[PDB]
Write a protein that binds this ligand. Structure first.
Ligand code: HEM
Ligand code: HEM
Ligand code: HEM
Ligand code: HEM
Lengths: 146, 141, 141, 146
């Protein structure tokens, strides 16, 4: 992963226009519907039991947003990631009890929420560069677990 | 395993795809080729590029593969006896890449089907693609 | 799936372990804790150290768990209905760590059993530990 | 993985005395018995069909040795691995057609051939340091695939 100066202009260019909303909460809602054993770190919230309403859900939509916003600091600092993420890697271990498998799981889903938002604008060419990014993030986040 | 609702959610989705099964299946083949470098290894004979009628020819016998998997969904083991005695004896394609292809079919998918790829559906489509996965994978050890 | 020879190779090995099942199972629990940092996360309540009678107490109800899995090996689904309605509803332990525990039980294993852990055996022991894995894992989606 | 100056003296100290024989071929034979779909890169050899004879096998025992010898240059250069392995990473892709999944698979097996050779001498303490090494090797070997 010593990505084209380029695939950045792109992995960046596509990113610009994640109207950071609809999008984060859909990654969010799509994850607790599909891989339902992640509803575990999240009865912190409400009604996650019929998907009309995980989606229908505000605390998710809010959580949703915050996860995506903090992913974006990643996209814009894709050089020395491990650094950007270091504190939340440090926080997601000793505070949060998150199956770091659940990170790789949320990128796979994201790269699918993304795939769906773009359609024909989300390629081959581009999916390879985001599958390059997502795993990058997951492994900077996947860090200081001891 | 697959609820009525699973067998269902799956049918809407596999009948939107229609006569585009191997149009999609070939562009799912491609992105795996694309996204994972790693898998192109069970393919050193194939012309991998945007061109590859070795990939579309290939990418047809796959979706041909999943079209008839929706249909014989009660008895998946029986429908796939051969096409998994094939994956096991011969091809011996490691049970790991199956998850990478299912995610390359899944995404695929999303793109040609945005409206109808709801999420009660991305969840039944993921169950089907894993079961298919598990069947193909079985005749190993 | 499991050949007669599988059901067999498995029995020699699970009867060498004897009254050491939860002696081994607790020192397999430990090395997962050890080798994978990652898994200690489904355990923030437990005193993880060399001491942990929370781990041996814990590490007993596991091998207790696999002792009775050798016995009801024809019908694994039925024997494990509860102890997997448990892994799925409640614990919701991600189906990935199962492979890390099976390899921490597998190794384990090797160490207390060098002579009798032939390799026609490391292969039947790996089939059993995966099936167990798959059963526990089932009641998910 | 910025391992104790120490766990080296150990991950090294245990290594010294891989009588590099019995051992490499057992990792070798144990891999094509257990995960039998790896017999694929290997009808280059003979009779791999009853395990008495994969073991019973010279071309394996030879292959066995060569894989372990080239793992040892790894153990003794565990700093900048990616470098040591770079050429064989480069060779195992464009020449060899190896499922890089089959590397992670052979470490897991090794850390088991090792576990069996030591018994009580192969700990907790030590298994953590070899599960630290094996994955290290697999990911330096796992490199320049394009
Ligand atoms: C791209 C992946 C991830 C990023 C960048 C991310 C980011 C964040 C951020 C910035 C916070 C706020 C913490 C603070 O105020 O300092 C947070 C909280 C949290 N995250 Fe993560 N996260 C990721 C993945 C995950 C996953 C996959 C899970 C669970 C499946 C998870 C579970 C939690 C929980 C439970 C909280 C706290 C929510 C609460 O207060 O109830 N995270 N995350
Ligand atoms: C949806 C998943 C799977 C299905 C339905 C499936 C189905 C098929 C079918 C129908 C064929 C053609 C059989 C024929 O030649 O008569 C085939 C061939 C083959 N498949 Fe699979 N497959 C799946 C997954 C995989 C994966 C993920 C890979 C590789 C990582 C793979 C690698 C191969 C290879 C190498 C061949 C040989 C075709 C040739 O000679 O070029 N398959 N598959
Ligand atoms: C051989 C594999 C598995 C078997 C046979 C098994 C069996 C069991 C059994 C018998 C219990 C005790 C039930 C009781 O409290 O009445 C239990 C509890 C539990 N298991 Fe599993 N298990 C397996 C794998 C896993 C894995 C790999 C993990 C974690 C990664 C895990 C995490 C837990 C947790 C967190 C509990 C709760 C016990 C407590 O409250 O401390 N299990 N398991
Ligand atoms: C620790 C893991 C690995 C190491 C360090 C390693 C090392 C080596 C070395 C040094 C060679 C000799 C090539 C030369 O002369 O330059 C070789 C050859 C080869 N390796 Fe790897 N290897 C590893 C894993 C694997 C795995 C897991 C497979 C297959 C499952 C594999 C398949 C092959 C094959 C087929 C050859 C050629 C044998 C022949 O000439 O028929 N290797 N390896």
């Amino acid at each position: 992963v010593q990505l084209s100066g380029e695939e950045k202009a792109a992995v960046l260019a596509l990113w610009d226009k994640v109207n950071e909303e609809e999008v984060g909460g859909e990654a969010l809602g799509r994850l607790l519907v599909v891989y339902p054993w992640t509803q575990r770190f999240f009865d912190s919230f409400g009604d996650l039991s019929n998907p009309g309403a995980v989606m229908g859900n505000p605390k998710v939509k809010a959580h949703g947003k915050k996860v995506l916003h903090s992913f974006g600091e990643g996209v814009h600092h894709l050089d020395n990631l491990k650094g950007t993420f270091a504190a939340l890697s440090e926080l997601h271990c000793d505070k949060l009890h998150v199956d770091p498998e659940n990170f790789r799981l949320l990128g796979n889903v994201l790269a699918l929420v993304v795939a769906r938002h773009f359609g024909k604008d989300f390629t081959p060419e581009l999916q390879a560069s985001y599958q390059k990014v997502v795993a990058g993030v997951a492994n900077a986040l996947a860090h200081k677990y001891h | 395993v697959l609820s009525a609702a699973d067998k269902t959610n799956v049918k809407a989705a596999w009948s939107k795809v229609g006569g585009h099964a191997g149009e999609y299946g070939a562009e799912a083949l491609e992105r795996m080729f694309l996204g994972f470098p790693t898998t192109k290894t069970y393919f050193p004979h194939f012309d991998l590029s945007h061109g590859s009628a070795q990939v579309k020819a290939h990418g047809k016998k796959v979706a041909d593969g999943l079209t008839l998997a929706v249909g014989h969904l009660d008895d998946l083991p029986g429908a796939l006896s051969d096409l998994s005695n094939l994956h096991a004896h011969k091809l011996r394609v490691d049970p790991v890449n199956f998850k990478l292809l299912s995610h390359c079919l899944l995404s695929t998918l999303a793109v040609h089907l945005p409206n109808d790829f709801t999420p009660a559906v991305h969840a039944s489509l993921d169950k089907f693609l894993s079961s298919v996965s598990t069947v193909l994978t079985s005749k190993y050890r």
